[PDB]
């Protein structure tokens, strides 16, 4: 049996990667419970609350991240090191219940997965 | 010369960008570039030590939920100001 | 007071934000009394002229937004023919020469050579690249 | 010995090298005795199915290269319908529903849902992203 | 885990990439990534100090005219080797 | 009268920017003699001789750089600082007669142009 890991590494809106990654994540969640989501590098920006992309004519797909909590996609992690490099409050109430992990821990956790899809 | 950065500083040849900045130039952060305006990020200091004024497009900060985390050194502008900034400078280097 | 602007779009209708910000920039400069001579679409920018583009009903329809800018403010929308060919954006005439069964150039856009980019750069007051 | 492969293409036919390297990778794995279960085209990867793509005569025709891979080795070429819609790549049936006068899906490609990406990831031995 | 880098190191969040490397992993440079294999470039040292083996796709070095400027520490492979590298590693992190 | 500057800042083949930039450069050269070309950042890689992109199914447009010498496009410059960061021999026989400039000089030269088109 394969375990699938989805990794968000890009900032939102500038590119549609986050939106299409979230779509792929949700479709996959319907076929397996063995999946996890990692927010690293610029992908940590995907987690910020209060985003209003319509200001730049982009789709507000951030709201859709709410479905992760709704449909039991609980294996969610965020790179603590990345948040620090970006000057982001580690206590920020993210739109996803992602627990922070230091470099070493996040690395080990990701190595447990058979497939990695990066967005 | 008006310098424009639409990409994340982490995915930009930042050293190359800094080398092109000359006194009197101005840098506008827009789209994913506005992340370089977040208080405490590692690219902020290099920008502050640059001989120029740095701006950030408000529309993009709003889109990314960053309006309350911008450094005081960075000037917030809208699209109309962006336009006037391009009118002010004869040239534009887009990154 | 008023300046002659030429905008260069190098990003797709959907995929990155470049074309969208360029569109919002165009609206802002026109609203501020300036003149938008033309918008040159090159590289991935040619996708902005793909008529078949079908966004969801709650997503911004950029392709028609461009068409509307041409219709309402007379802004010339120039698409590099060669760049468009390589990316599958062709008009009816080109499709006929190429033996293709259909075409997809959005009404309001004008196929052109790179000479139109050079001419805009040489004659407009300002050139802003997106 | 032989492994079941699933390839994910996220870049255009022309514009970046990703789709090209993925194609060269596909040929190499098949030549090395492995099985290429399918290639999933997502994001800008959907442009690889744009039938109207017209490269110069001295440029590699990647779109047909993909078609040939399907024809010769039976590799399934799956295109995410939603991603394709947003970027103007539609087949005849979709064009009819959308009221469009033409379509541009290259023969050999199969429109599909993201479920095909998930299924390939869950059942193939390896997944390589380009 | 097989790490793949298809972009120029100058346009990649290199710090983020290094943080994901674990002993036993391998990094393959391909497409524009092969520039990080040029002897003397500023990203080469960080790679050498990483607990992994670094490979570079020969086809891409040939395309960019860099075949004679590669560091001795980097292993040259072709597409067939690339395939075997993906067979060897159960997972692939693509940058 | 406007002076146009073309700046190559990306590596070849990975993206089609160099090819389409060179095409734009040549079309412009037909309408004016007041143009210059700058090779900075990764764009310095555009200048390397012996490139054989057909190996990766990419167009060999580097050969086309020969037309710069053929049709009097002589204002050509290359960033010396960039070449050093990339470990490239400053004495390399580039495919374009670009004279190296240090950061300060290149910067001043570019500021003389009215329009800058980056590829």
UniProtKB/Swiss-Prot annotation, chains A, F:
One of its GO terms (biological process) is tRNA wobble position uridine thiolation. Its main location: cytoplasm. The keyword rRNA processing does not apply. GO terms for cellular component: sulfurtransferase complex. Keywords: Cytoplasm, tRNA processing. Heterohexamer, formed by a dimer of trimers. The hexameric TusBCD complex contains 2 copies each of TusB, TusC and TusD. The TusBCD complex interacts with TusE. Part of a sulfur-relay system required for 2-thiolation of 5-methylaminomethyl-2-thiouridine (mnm(5)s(2)U) at tRNA wobble positions. This is Protein TusC. It comes from Escherichia coli (strain K12).
Curated annotation (Swiss-Prot), chains B, E:
It is found in: Cytoplasm. InterPro entries: DsrEFH-like (IPR027396), Sulphur_relay_TusB (IPR023526), Sulphur_relay_TusB/DsrH (IPR007215). One of its GO terms (cellular component) is sulfurtransferase complex. Keywords: Cytoplasm, tRNA processing. The keyword Membrane does not apply. GO terms for biological process: tRNA wobble position uridine thiolation. It comes from the Bacteria. Belongs to the DsrH/TusB family. Heterohexamer, formed by a dimer of trimers. The hexameric TusBCD complex contains 2 copies each of TusB, TusC and TusD. The TusBCD complex interacts with TusE. PANTHER family: PROTEIN TUSB. Part of a sulfur-relay system required for 2-thiolation of 5-methylaminomethyl-2-thiouridine (mnm(5)s(2)U) at tRNA wobble positions. This is Protein TusB. It comes from Escherichia coli (strain K12).
Curated annotation (Swiss-Prot), chains C, D:
Part of a sulfur-relay system required for 2-thiolation of 5-methylaminomethyl-2-thiouridine (mnm(5)s(2)U) at tRNA wobble positions. Accepts sulfur from TusA and transfers it in turn to TusE. It comes from the Bacteria. Its EC number is 2.8.1.-. The keyword Nucleotide-binding does not apply. GO terms for molecular function: sulfur carrier activity; sulfurtransferase activity. SUPFAM superfamilies: DsrEFH-like. The gene is tusD. GO terms for cellular component: cytosol; sulfurtransferase complex. Its main location: cytoplasm. Belongs to the DsrE/TusD family. This is Sulfurtransferase TusD.
